[PDB]
Amino acid sequence: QLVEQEVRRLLATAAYKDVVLTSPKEGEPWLLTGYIQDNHARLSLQNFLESHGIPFRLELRSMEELRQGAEFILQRLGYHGIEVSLAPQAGWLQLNGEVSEEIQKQKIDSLLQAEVPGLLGVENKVRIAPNQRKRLDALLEQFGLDSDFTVNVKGELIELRGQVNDEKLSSFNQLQQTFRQEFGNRPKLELVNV
């Protein structure tokens, strides 16, 4: 009837495009479920329902609250290079940025779903970050230096330890030039005579 028609006209607007109304029977509250873009939109719908003398229950989630939740979870789990935005589907988020190969294996999309209530899915567009260790070892092997130098990693400081002679010093200098051209100033390679 009329009031239901008025409510459904509001639900046909873009702010309420992810809200569902299940009509009650006699004497039960009207049930509205789904998603809204932010809490402000929820409050406006509440206002509208109350002005029609409608008894109701809202079971709605804010996409901005899902997005902020996901940001908090990524932060507390030590992920720093990831930006969270909305995906095209209701209840879905999107990730951009970069992570290491090892960390990608943690299946962060499903992990975010476990940690963020009402998250229906994640479109994960992050790329794989530079793997400096892997490239260093590839270069050492490519140049026949992998038995001359031993790699010791402490944070972003990588020591190449060996019994340094003139050959090894000049080979190190070439390796370091090549490494720097690709990675800039992180991590740093130090030559260490032992």
Residue numbers in the entry: 154 to 347
What do the study's own words say?
acts as a connector between the secretin and the IM (YscD, PrgH, MxiG). YscD is known to have four periplasmic domains.
